[PDB]
A paper describes a structure:
Here we demonstrate that CEP85 is essential for faithful centriole duplication through a direct interaction with the previously uncharacterised N-terminal domain of STIL, a key factor involved in the early steps of centriole formation.
Subsequently, we also determined the structure of the complex between Trichoplax adhaerens STIL-NTD and human CEP85 cc4 by X-ray crystallography to a resolution of 4.6 Å. Compared with the unbound CEP85 coiled-coil structure we did not observe any density for the N-terminal half of the coiled-coil, probably due to its partial unfolding in the crystal. The interaction between the CEP85 coiled-coil and STIL NTD involves mainly subdomain 1 of STIL, in particular the region of the β-barrel capping helix and the crossover hairpin-loop that, together, constitute one of the two conserved patches in the STIL NTD. Each of the STIL NTDs interacts with both CEP85 coiled-coil helices. The crossover hairpin-loop of subdomain 1 of STIL NTD contacts towards the N-terminal part of one of the coiled-coil helices, whereas its barrel capping helix contacts towards the C-terminal end of the other CEP85 coiled-coil helix. However, several conserved residues of the CEP85 coiled-coil and STIL subdomain 1 would be well placed to make electrostatic and hydrophobic interactions with each other. The structure of the complex between STIL NTD and CEP85 cc4 indicated that the highly conserved residues L47 and R50 in Trichoplax adhaerens STIL (L64 and R67 in human STIL, L60 and R63 in Gallus gallus STIL) and human CEP85 Q640 and E644 are located at their interaction interface.
Numbering used by the authors: 13 to 215, 222 to 348
The structure:
Amino acid sequence: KLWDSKAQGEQEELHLLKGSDCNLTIDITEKCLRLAQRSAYQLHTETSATKRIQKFFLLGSLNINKDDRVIINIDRFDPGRIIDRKEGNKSLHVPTAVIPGDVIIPLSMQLACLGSEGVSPFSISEYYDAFQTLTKNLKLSCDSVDIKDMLSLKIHATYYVDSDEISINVTSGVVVPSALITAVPILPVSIVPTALARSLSGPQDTQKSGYVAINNSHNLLLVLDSDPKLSSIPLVGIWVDGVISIHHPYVWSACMRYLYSQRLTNKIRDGSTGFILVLYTQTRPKPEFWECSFSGKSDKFLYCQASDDIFMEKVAKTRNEYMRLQLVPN
C-alpha cells in the first residue's frame, strides 16, 4: 500500500452542482437581450428569402455566491466575426473577441412562424457538436483548472415585435459532465517540505491547483500544473488551495480534469485505485486529505433547459432589469 486509506470521516459525494442543489442560475441583463433582438431584427430585414434565424454570441461571467450557489451573469452581446480558414468553402462564425474569463454562450434566435409550444433548445445538431468540442478541449487542455471549461450553454430565443412592445420566449440550455466523485477523509501523509509546500501551508480568494508526485523516499512532492515533467512523472493525485469546503465546484472540476487528462501519461493512481486530494482550506491552517474514487459511466452527462417569456417596452427604461433562469434537468 502506497498510503493508508482508512476512512477518518464521513464520505462525501461530489458533483458540479451538488452544493447548489443541482440548480444552475442564469441572470441575463434585459439590456443585452434588447441589443440581441435589435441585431436580429436588422438581420431579419436585410434579406427576404433567408428565413429569420440570427446567429450571435452572449458574453457572461461565472460567479459563486455565499453558499456555493453557481450563477452565470450574462451582460454583453457580441454579434461576432466571420473568418475563413479556406479548408472548406463555407465561412465560419466566431465570437467577436474572446476575453479570458468570458463565458461564451452561442445565441440563436428566430421569429416564430405561428406558434411553437415545443421548445428544442441547444439542439443536438449544433449543441451536440459543440459539446463534443467542449469535452475534447477538456481532455487535452494544459491550462489551470477553469470552471468555465466544464459546461456548454446555448440559448434559443423566439421574438416578436409590434408597435407597442417586444416579446421574447427565451429557452436556455446547458450540458455538463455527470460524473460523481466519491471522497473519503484519510489520515495525513508526509509531504516533502519544498518551497511550494511551504508557501501552500502558509497564508486572496484565488483558486489554484496542481498534481501530486512521489520521490524515492516515498515522500509526497507537490507539483505545479505547468511543470513539464508532468508528461511522464508518476502522478497519484492533486492539490487544491483556496476553497472553504470540499463542496466548492472547483474541487469537482479539478478531479474531473485529473481523471480526463491524457497529457499525464503516468497516472499510476486513478479513479479505480483511488487518488489523493490535498485540500488547503481557508478555515484551517493545515490541509485536509481525501481519497477520491469513481466507478460509474465515463461519458455520461447531465443537461437541461429553462424557458420563460419576457415583455419589454420599446423604450429601454433606465433600470437594471434582468431575467433569471434556473436549471430543470430531465
